[PDB]
Amino acid sequence: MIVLFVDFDYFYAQVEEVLNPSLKGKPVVVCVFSGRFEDSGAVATANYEARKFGVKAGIPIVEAKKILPNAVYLPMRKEVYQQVSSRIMNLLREYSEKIEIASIDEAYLDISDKVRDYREAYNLGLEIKNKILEKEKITVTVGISKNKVFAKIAADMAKPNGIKVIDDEEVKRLIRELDIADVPGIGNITAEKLKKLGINKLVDTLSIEFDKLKGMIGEAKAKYLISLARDEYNEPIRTRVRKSIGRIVTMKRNSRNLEEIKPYLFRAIEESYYKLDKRIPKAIHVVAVTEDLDIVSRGRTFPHGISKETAYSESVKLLQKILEEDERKIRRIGVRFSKFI
DNA sequence: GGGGGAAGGATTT
DNA sequence: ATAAATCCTTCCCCCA
Numbered sequence: 001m002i003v004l005f006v007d008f009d010y011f012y013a014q015v016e017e018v019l020n021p022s023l024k025g026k027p028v029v030v031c032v033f034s035g036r037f038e039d040s041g042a043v044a045t046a047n048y049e050a051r052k053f054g055v056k057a058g059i060p061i062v063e064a065k066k067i068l069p070n071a072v073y074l075p076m077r078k079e080v081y082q083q084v085s086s087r088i089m090n091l092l093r094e095y096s097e098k099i100e101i102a103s104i105d106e107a108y109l110d111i112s113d114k115v116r117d118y119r120e121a122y123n124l125g126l127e128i129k130n131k132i133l134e135k136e137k138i139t140v141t142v143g144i145s146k147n148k149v150f151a152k153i154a155a156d157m158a159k160p161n162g163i164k165v166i167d168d169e170e171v172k173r174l175i176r177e178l179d180i181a182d183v184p185g186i187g188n189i190t191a192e193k194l195k196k197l198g199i200n201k202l203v204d205t206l207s208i209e210f211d212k213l214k215g216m217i218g219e220a221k222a223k224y225l226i227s228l229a230r231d232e233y234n235e236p237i238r239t240r241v242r243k244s245i246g247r248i249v250t251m252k253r254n255s256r257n258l259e260e261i262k263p264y265l266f267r268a269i270e271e272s273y274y275k276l277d278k279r280i281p282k283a284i285h286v287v288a289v290t291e292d293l294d295i296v297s298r299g300r301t302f303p304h305g306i307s308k309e310t311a312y313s314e315s316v317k318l319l320q321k322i323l324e325e326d327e328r329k330i331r332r333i334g335v336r337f338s339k340f341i
Numbered sequence: 342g343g344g345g346g347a348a349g350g351a352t353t354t
Numbered sequence: 355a356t357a358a359a360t361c362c363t364t365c366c367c368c369c370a
């Protein structure tokens with residue numbers, strides 16, 4: 001199999017640069033203003049200019065403005081970035097019917113029936129980079145390898161504006177030298193658990209007793225890494241079918257007053273049904289971020305579809321189930337629909 | 342013992 | 355101190 005993976009460079013920030021090229025070159029910071037007080041919220045992402053000084057996705061907008069007080073701060077415009085993404089994702093389809101849109105700025109292409117070797121594939125990668133740069137003025141990074149995992153790892157090594165190929169040869173090398181924490185699907189918690197087991201490279205999973213590995217990181221993960229270590233991993237590229245859709249919103253101020261939260265909750269539901277579009281959910285979940293940032297959710301499933309009206313009533317029931325089973329004040333509140341028909 | 346499915350916390354991104 | 359989704363593990367009914 002030959003898989004070409006595409007990841008848009010500092011997407012949100014870049015899109016802003018595209019709609020305002022004067023920004024090009026200066027440090028740009030896209031933020032999510034939570035409005036609980038002037039400049040509350042976080043940095044969704046920043047371009048490399050700003051990234052260069054520690055301003056990056058995740059940090060508080062306040063911290064940011066301290067390091068780069070004179071950087072361009074813009075509010076996140078998801079809808080806009082969503083539409084650009086959509087235009088680019090379509091250009092990608094021109095190159096393969098077998099495409100797997102993984103995220104708003106990531107796509108997997110199975111180009112097995114398009115090229116014969118990595119040289120051809122590499123070229124196709126450049127063709128694609130030029131197409132997107134031309135059509136949308138957006139730079140991306142291309143990762144190419146035998147499976148999705150390595151195609152992604154490739155992109156990771158090459159971004160920004162790069163392109164890399166990991167041949168069957170280097171794959172083998174990487175299975176022995178790559179820091180296992182850098183493997184897709186392995187976050188801090190798993191990486192940590194692995195370190196404790198003397199497993200720092202993929203290959204290490206082959207020399208450890210399975211059941212001991214399973215008991216630590218779980219059967220799914222254990223199998224996943226082992227298949228990678230055995231150079232046997234090779235899941236097919238598949239159309240992504242959104243299994244759940246929801247919206248979560250931060251409140252002006254903490255609270256556990258059902259009447260003070262409802263607005264946020266309903267708002268979340270509305271934004272959700274709009275996103276649902278045609279999709280009818282049978283399950284619903286309410287999620288709340290408590291004041292100490294712990295997360296609590298309560299849901300319910302129905303034997304039939306759910307009308308928006310139902311969602312409203314039912315979501316309030318769940319909100320209360322939360323409010324009564326947890327004494328902490330709520331900070332952020334959301335709803336999540338799933339099990340579509 | 343385990344299929345099957347529901348629920349809630351865990352983990353990744 | 356943003357936000358969106360999927361992934362494990364647990365509990366529970368019950369097997370014709």
Ligand SMILES: Nc1ncnc2c1ncn2[C@H]1C[C@H](O)[C@@H](COP(=O)(O)OP(=O)(O)OP(=O)(O)O)O1
Pocket residue numbers: 007008009010011012013043044045046057058059105159
């Ligand atoms: N709190 C956080 N801590 C660390 N990383 C974060 C945090 N919040 C978000 N991020 C990550 C997810 C962001 O939406 C992602 C953003 O941007 P982009 O401009 O595409 O990046 P990129 O190409 O370097 O990486 P990527 O595509 O993986 O997101 O950075």
Ligand SMILES: *[C@@H]1c2c(cc3ccc4cccc5ccc2c3c45)[C@@H](O)[C@H](O)[C@@H]1O
Pocket residue numbers: 058354
């Ligand atoms: C959102 C959130 C938080 C922490 C992290 C940490 C590392 C991340 C790496 C890549 C992507 C990413 C996306 C969202 C994150 C990330 C990361 C928390 O601080 C916060 O409470 C949210 O869960």
Ligand SMILES: [Ca+2]
Pocket residue numbers: 007008009010011105
């Ligand atoms: Ca990207």
Ligand SMILES: [Ca+2]
Pocket residue numbers: 181182183186187188
């Ligand atoms: Ca990692």
Ligand SMILES: [Ca+2]
Pocket residue numbers: 294295
């Ligand atoms: Ca908890």
Ligand SMILES: [Mg+2]
Pocket residue numbers: 007103105106
């Ligand atoms: Mg990405």
